Amino acid sequence: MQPRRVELWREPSKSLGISIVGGREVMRGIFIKHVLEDSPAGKNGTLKPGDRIVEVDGMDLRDASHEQAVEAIRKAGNPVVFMVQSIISTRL
């Protein structure tokens, strides 16, 4: 599907509620591993496992390292603005 914008509003003393994997190579891109249901990301509802993170707070992450992505997200203000894109998957 098409790339889309996600604005995560931080909550004090809570993590955003995502885990990320990947980065600059079995998984070059940066992707969402998990989303905690009872969390900012869960409450948002539009960020999903398997979503590729293409930008965070204006910074291009399309050829980024795991560290650059982690850093971009941690140093983002509020809201944390992602551009994400879903990847094709198969249910078995």
Next chain:
Amino acid sequence: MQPRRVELWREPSKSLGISIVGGREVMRGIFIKHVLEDSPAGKNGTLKPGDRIVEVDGMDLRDASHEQAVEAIRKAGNPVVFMVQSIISTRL
């Protein structure tokens, strides 16, 4: 972590309870996207989102296409035997 063996026992009229992403390139490797809690994969308990699928029922999937992996899993007997390896992730 180390590669490990997972034996999924199929249940009649139920899907295995996994979704997979990736394949032969933002995600070259084959990885578990989702595991349904109330399913064979969920009941097993040892297969997790973010796990790289390296073999299925004896077939090497280390340079496999999405289609080859889907096919390997669908054509597997019972139990469906995976070799998987976790990838590093970061919680935010």
